[PDB]
Design a protein around this nucleic acid. Structure first.
Length: 80
RNA sequence: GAAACUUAAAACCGUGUUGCACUGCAACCCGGAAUUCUUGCACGUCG
């Protein structure tokens, strides 16, 4: 509500442009069969990371999960 | 003139729906704004 009049025009606010003009959507993954056509087994990888110490270096572990870099999503939005 | 009840007996009673027809109805978005984000070397030590 303190943004520009061009950002508060297509995104909403609660002062004078009460509704969007832009409708975003949720997006599922689409190319699942194209990923198992190649050599991909799981849709999400598991990545191990480290945090080293800058003196007498000892490290503690954490595990991160993320979507693989071959994925494709069906982007869409409406304008009124 | 003094002396002998226009008295006795007789229900203002019997029968009869405050009843018949009638929508608490028509019109109205629990709606508008908001990133599950910020920092982090799978690494150190070798008779």
């Amino acid at each position: 509500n303190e943004d520009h009049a061009h950002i508060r025009r297509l995104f909403g606010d609660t002062e004078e442009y009460m509704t969007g003009r832009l409708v975003f959507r949720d997006t599922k993954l689409t190319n699942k069969d194209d990923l198992e056509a190649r050599g991909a087994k799981t849709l999400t990888e598991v990545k191990f990371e480290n945090a080293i110490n800058r003196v007498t270096a000892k490290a503690n572990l954490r595990q991160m999960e993320r979507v693989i870099p071959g994925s494709e999503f069906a982007f869409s939005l409406v304008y009124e």
